[PDB]
Symmetry: C4
């Protein structure tokens, strides 16, 4: 995998669709110097600073970062990245981790308000029905019960102690062996009710600009209105969960997954409970916003 | 009463309009095996599983169950069932009870969110003004203060210890000796205000597709706007409560009433307080949703 | 003052506009017998019972009560009543008091939900800035910050111990010596903002059907938008409060004022604090609803 | 600076745009006599009294006050006042301070509901990230996340003990050396999202009636939608904060700043924490409402 200014990029061991982007130690060192004056708390109060820290990182990569992130995330054949910075790999560096993740996100779009934290990101600690270790968290898309589309999901590993399992699960729609069967079903186009934990109605599948399937699915929030929709959804669920195309991805401390939420589903594998278990995560979810040469009216 | 695959059906001792459906021990055994992998908690999070457990039970009855439930519930001459499964008859089996009731409901429609429990069903324990033993709960219809129609009411007996009385009361509109007198009154068609414990306005009576009376009445939530509406409603109330057509139905542990809420009213008889009284109930309320050969437009 | 069936009516000592209606001991005795089966709690849950207890009282007065209440309350020259029943005059009889007040109100209209109690009436106990004894409560109309009109105000004295002062104050617009001066001012017709403790806009004065002034005024909830409206309202306030037409009315235990809120203002005089002071009140507020021979369309 | 009836007016030491208005001891004495009958609590309940106390003060200044306040606040070349009354200069006089500030505000407009206090003004005590002494509070305009425009900001110093720093910062748009550069940028006219701590959309700049720049900006509530808006806002922020036109104004106890919020920004300098620090402030924010000879339709 290739050499860019300030970082390297290589395919993952799980899939060529998922690429691993690592910022050099020198880029990392300089980034942290140049953003030291804004603590995370400044980023939380002034959203424009989220874009500024973005600019600082991209400028350190000779402006090669932003176009690469976008080309990868929007490329149907790929659409997923695992990102890290050499030197940021310990829980003591959580703030620095948030700054990094924030900078990358705000080069490609904007992170949405998170109702769990009341901020643009959320950090969660896991320590020893839905909260359950031996439970796989089923593959899904985020953002299914609001009108606005969530284009990206960012999941960062902040701490990991005494943890067995709990890999991120991923499925690219084009690796799913049953796509054609479910996409070509009439109920693939049936608007269904999705309800928060005001209701919205949208189909479970849609298409991208070129007519290729995309999904907006989660088992917990979809609300089949009758026996027809119900049985079909229970079959679709089994067809996703038993897929041979599912990826299992370890996310080491300091690294984060950044994926296109339209044609990747994500989930979490089970893990072993242990009295001294500690896992800390950070999430952001947002929309893409980027410049292209395209048409406009007026002056 | 007749033999179907997996269950038997017979008229009740109270009325030929109310039929008693009992699943055989073998059906019950197999149902519980085949649904063991989804605990009630799974059904609460993923509504499609509610329809799946429905399918499993109907499949065990050679697909004779679903059409029989619908034919009975929609039949004006009947419209009520008391349902049980041989082998499920103790409070220790409450989860199994919920699964059964859920499976039957989601063959005929879908159960609505219950604001008391925050789930698609609600379980309540009674132990020693509105909470009162010596108080009869007056005959009524459910769902009178929302715009959407509640088609069915399901009441299951989960536990019963040291209980005297407290039978379910039922009245089929066609057994009510004063129907003609109240239905033909001009105020039968007067939209009246109904208010939750946003207000809705609907008449106290309406008609089914064939022009036969249906009701949407409850004394607590109807809000007569003046002396005219008030006196008439107080007279209608007395005329319902003193009706000779009222049924009194014991609901033993493991059994549930499932009734058409348009032309049956329901209520509860008084019961004797006792220091060691324990009654546990489960309710679901929902709409009908079923396939028929009927017209549609477009392709 | 005159003799009707079941009650007597006479002018007050304060004004010929305020009439005193007293139910005979026999009417009272029979009313209480005939309504004993519905405790106040029944009236709170089933609003139609509020109209029924109305019917029972009017029937006991040979149907002379309802037309007299309406003729008095709607008569511009009067519009106020002080009502009592011989034999109901002690705090121990508070429930009976509520039943009586309820019966009278629901012969002339319907009492509105009271947000302080969550019921159709509210009972308040006073015992030892706004809560202040040496503070007169300024003359006002109720219902000024909702779109719907409040036609009547009912204030009943439930208990009174160790109380000096605290009479009800009343002003009939036609006894107000400054009416013409304020009514003919351009700001009398200026819609002004009124805001709850969504905002509404209405003028401080309006007219009845015959073009005679009515008011919708309270100093606490009117929200002058500028110096013009502000100064004028402060002058109007002084002109109401220093009026020579103000009535001061003692309301003995068991008695209640029932007034037309369009052309009477009400308030409360100061009272002496005392360690063993106890005053208990009940209020209802509502709209008029009554039959008359008038035009309608269709069949 | 000039002599008016009841007060004097002189330019500040910081700028000729900011004028210092001091009521004479005699005006002050008479004002306090003539408003003694309405405690602050009366002003809080009856908003018309806020305008009345205004009238009393202006009347004491031969009606020269109101026109001078308006001429100053609306004058583009000025638009800011520092106001005090000889004899009101101690925390023990806080109520008198509120009355004074209220009287002045309600000669020029009306103060809006303050959600922090639930009243038309708010008092705050400061004693020993956003709450931070060594933090400058950045220059901003108030009222940026509601549809209605806030025309004035009033900040009064009620108490000051053991305080180093914490001056009010001010910037008049016409003293800002980078105005032309940012105002002439296309994003100056881009409606941007502003969100409360329902969202509103307005540009960061607008124009007054003569086409001169005005601002509606605060770093905390503006929500850049993408990298373009974000970077530009971070640059605008630096350009405001490092401006050589910024004023630093000490506000002694008893004095208050009253500024035009359209073409002045305000903020606060850092201050030294001290164990026995006590600063008490009062704020009001409102709209202008005043008489002028202008056109109207109808009669
Ligand atoms: Fe997710
Ligand atoms: Fe019910
Ligand atoms: Fe009142
Ligand atoms: Fe401010």
């Amino acid at each position: 995998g290739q050499d860019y200014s300030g970082f390297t990029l290589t395919p993952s061991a799980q899939s060529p669709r998922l690429l691993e982007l690592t910022f050099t130690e020198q880029t990392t060192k300089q980034f942290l110097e140049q953003v030291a004056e804004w603590p995370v708390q400044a980023l939380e109060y002034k959203s424009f600073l989220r874009f500024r820290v973005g600019k600082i990182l991209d400028d350190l990569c000779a402006n090669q970062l932003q176009p690469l992130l976008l080309k990868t995330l929007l490329n149907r054949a790929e659409g997923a990245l695992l990102i890290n910075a050499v030197g940021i790999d310990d829980v003591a560096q959580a703030d620095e981790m948030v700054k990094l993740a924030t900078a990358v996100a705000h080069l490609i779009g904007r992170s949405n308000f998170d109702a769990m934290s009341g901020q643009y990101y959320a950090r969660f600690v896991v320590k020893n029905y839905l909260r359950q270790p031996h439970r796989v968290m089923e593959l899904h898309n985020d953002g299914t019960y609001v009108e606005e589309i969530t284009d990206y999901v960012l999941m960062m590993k902040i701490d990991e102690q005494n943890m067995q399992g709990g890999n991120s699960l991923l499925l690219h729609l084009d690796d799913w062996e049953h796509l054609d069967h479910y996409f070509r079903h009439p109920l693939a186009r049936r608007p269904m009710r999705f309800a928060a934990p005001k209701d919205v109605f949208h189909p479970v599948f849609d298409v991208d600009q070129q007519g290729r399937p995309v999904m907006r699915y989660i088992d917990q929030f979809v609300q089949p209105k009758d026996f027809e929709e119900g049985v079909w959804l229970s079959e679709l669920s089994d067809a996703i969960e038993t897929s041979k195309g599912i990826l299992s991805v370890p996310v080491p401390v300091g690294k984060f997954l950044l994926i296109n939420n339209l044609f990747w589903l994500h989930g979490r594998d089970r893990f072993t409970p242990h009295p001294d278990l500690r896992r800390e995560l950070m999430r952001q979810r947002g929309y893409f916003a980027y410049a292209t040469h395209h048409y406009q009216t007026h002056q």
